[PDB]
From a paper:
Association of receptor activity-modifying proteins (RAMP1-3) with the G protein-coupled receptor (GPCR) calcitonin receptor-like receptor (CLR) enables selective recognition of the peptides calcitonin gene-related peptide (CGRP) and adrenomedullin (AM) that have diverse functions in the cardiovascular and lymphatic systems. CGRP, AM, and AM2 binding to their cognate class B receptor, the calcitonin receptor-like receptor (CLR), is dependent on association of CLR with one of three accessory membrane proteins that determine ligand selectivity; receptor activity-modifying proteins (RAMPs) 1, 2, or 3 (Hong et al., 2012; McLatchie et al., 1998). CLR:RAMP1 is a CGRP receptor, CLR:RAMP2 preferentially recognizes AM and is called the AM1 receptor, and CLR:RAMP3 binds both AM and AM2 with high affinities and is called the AM2 receptor. We report crystal structures of CGRP analog-bound CLR:RAMP1 and AM-bound CLR:RAMP2 extracellular domain heterodimers at 2.5 and 1.8 Å resolutions, respectively.
Numbering used by the authors:
A (entry chain B): 35 to 52
B (entry chain A): 3 to 374, 1055 to 1139, 2032 to 2129
Write the structure that this text describes.
């Protein structure tokens, strides 16, 4: 679980992202 | 159309545009010609887009590194200064704006990054990068930090990455071999590792940008920053007692900033080329014009010898040039746009932990090379390049196409490549061409597999594996079940980048739990996606891209 990436990329949550 | 009888000038928002407008005022007083100075966001990108259609400013200011690409695109007038005028500027500043043997812009001033330090916090700043961790530990005990600088732009991190042997291209015998690139090499890896370890150990934060670093320094919170001459005005206003000095060494060698020459080009589509020339030669490039801009935000070491001499005793300028001599003048060749995009992506990926430093640099160089040698010049060629690599990886492992352990890395790299180039070419992701490519692999490589789900018979990291497994399942499920059995208007099943969404009736807000991909996602919170009254998935109006709402996952 610490092997997961720390922070979801903000750009992918933004209106430009997914 | 660019309007005749006036001048529109673009220059970046960190430079002395108010001072430049005062130069414009003097021009208009004398000639009646109005000069408008603008500082659009992302102007180095905006210029080639608008000028390609014969629009844009009459005059564009940037560092010289972008100008060869502009010239190659047919966007710049060749400038024609006479011998007497050329003699007024340093030969090496003309060399920065000389491309294929022609002058493509007027050189204005030499910029290099320095180490800027707070004398009240740190009277003897560190000579080496290696001592910065221990120093930060001391400072943190007192509520301060050692170092903050812009991590978002690779300009600021390149000095460290180059120190032990990173390079863009080598200028030998008057030529650049763009096949010989120094992004993916041991020295670049060592310097990027060191940067990443600073972040891992909480001496720096991966999110730090220009504004955050400037504000921390100017408020007295951080003992050091890294910046150019333009930044000294705001420091002066803040009254921090600062010094400007040589950058720290890494592994015993100098940090090597990439040196820029602020330059001014004339748009090939301007109907005012003569006016632009007069402004640039006889108003801006004079002691009085350069003083006006410099008083607003410092230029560095100006190209005009008379004024450079006047200001040369500034120790901050001396420091600027000592750093410059340790670094390298940037190339001006067209490949620079792709070089910088590569370094930016590598740094972002490694600093966030998304990729290892080795993978980040290796992929950055692979995709940059695709552009440098002319194979990839748009998204259609990019997708062909990504597919061809993928095929080359899949062909020898045919008996194992149904084994996730053998195909996961090629399949993941396929998506990394398609998505890299989408961002590069200002497209969204997913997009219809990339989706067609992914469907094609499902058709030709995975069609004999018995299961919708991936199954087994270096590996991807935990997060990437979760995303790619979900992706595979989603495409396989679409392949399995194209039909809609119910009567009516329905959005179709779709992969959004992170999650699979079932087909649903028009006018539904579908909901699923947040995926467990990231440590800062709450897997009990919800993700929503709207299927509109016409049976199309909702597009965000800011982008016009199909858009899922993950905003609650992260809170
Ligand atoms: O970070 C990549 C970027 O680096 C340089 O841009 C500098 C510029 O030269 C300075 O004048 C100042 O404005 O900061 C910029 C960095 O944010 C290259 O000139 C530029 O082409 C490149 O994209």
């Amino acid at each position: 679980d610490k092997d997961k990436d720390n922070v979801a990329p903000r750009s992918k949550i933004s209106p430009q992202g997914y | 159309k660019i309007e005749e009888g006036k001048l529109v000038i673009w220059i970046n928002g960190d430079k002395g545009y108010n001072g430049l407008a005062e130069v414009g005022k003097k021009f208009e007083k004398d000639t009646g010609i109005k000069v408008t100075v603008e500082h659009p966001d992302k102007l180095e990108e905006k210029f080639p887009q608008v000028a390609a259609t014969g629009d844009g400013p009459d005059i564009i200011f940037w560092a010289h590194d972008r100008f060869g690409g502009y010239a190659q695109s047919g966007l710049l007038a060749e400038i024609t200064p006479d011998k007497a005028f050329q003699d007024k500027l340093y030969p090496f500043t003309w060399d920065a704006v000389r491309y294929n043997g022609k002058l493509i812009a007027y050189p204005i001033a030499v910029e290099a990054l320095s180490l800027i330090y707070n004398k009240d916090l740190l009277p003897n700043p560190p000579k080496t990068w290696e001592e910065i961790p221990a120093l930060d530990k001391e400072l943190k005990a007192k509520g301060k930090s050692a170092l903050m600088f812009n991590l978002q732009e690779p300009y600021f991190t390149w000095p460290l990455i180059a120190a032990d042997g990173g390079y863009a291209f080598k200028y030998e015998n008057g030529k650049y071999d763009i096949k010989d690139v120094g992004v993916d090499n041991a020295g670049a890896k060592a310097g990027l590792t060191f940067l990443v370890d600073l972040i891992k150990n909480k001496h720096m934060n991966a999110d730090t940008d220009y504004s955050i670093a400037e504000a921390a320094f100017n408020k007295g919170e951080t003992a050091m920053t890294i910046n150019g001459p333009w930044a000294w005005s705001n420091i002066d206003t803040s009254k921090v007692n600062y010094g400007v000095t040589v950058l720290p060494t890494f592994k015993g060698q100098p940090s090597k900033p990439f040196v820029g020459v602020l330059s001014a080009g004339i748009n090939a589509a301007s109907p005012n080329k003569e006016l632009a020339k007069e402004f640039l030669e006889n108003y801006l490039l004079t002691d009085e014009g350069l003083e006006a801009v410099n008083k607003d935000k410092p230029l560095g070491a100006v190209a005009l010898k008379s004024y450079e001499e006047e200001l040369a005793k500034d120790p901050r300028i001396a420091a600027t040039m000592e750093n410059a001599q340790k670094g390298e003048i940037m190339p001006n060749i067209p490949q620079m746009s792709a070089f910088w995009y590569a370094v930016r992506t590598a740094v972002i990926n490694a600093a966030s932990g998304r990729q290892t430093v080795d993978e980040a640099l290796k992929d950055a160089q692979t995709n940059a090379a695709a552009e440098f040698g002319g194979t990839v010049k748009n998204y259609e060629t990019a997708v062909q390049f990504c597919w061809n690599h993928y095929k080359d990886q899949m062909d020898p492992i045919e008996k194992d196409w149904c084994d996730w352990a053998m195909i996961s890395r090629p399949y993941s790299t396929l998506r990394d490549c398609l998505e890299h180039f989408a961002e590069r070419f200002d497209l969204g992701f997913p997009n219809p061409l990339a989706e067609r490519i992914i469907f094609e692999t499902h058709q030709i490589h995975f069609a004999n597999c018995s299961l919708v789900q991936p199954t087994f018979s270096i590996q991807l990291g935990v997060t990437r594996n979760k995303i790619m497994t979900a992706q595979y399942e989603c495409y396989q499920k679409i392949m399995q079940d194209p039909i809609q059995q119910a009567e009516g208007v329905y959005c179709n099943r779709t992969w959004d980048g992170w999650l699979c969404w079932n087909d649903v009736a028009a006018g539904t807000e579908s909901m699923q739990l947040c995926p467990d991909y990231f440590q800062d996602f709450d897997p009990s919170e919800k993700v929503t996606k709207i299927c509109d009254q016409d049976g199309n998935w909702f597009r965000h109006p800011a982008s016009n891209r199909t858009w899922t709402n993950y905003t609650q996952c992260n809170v």
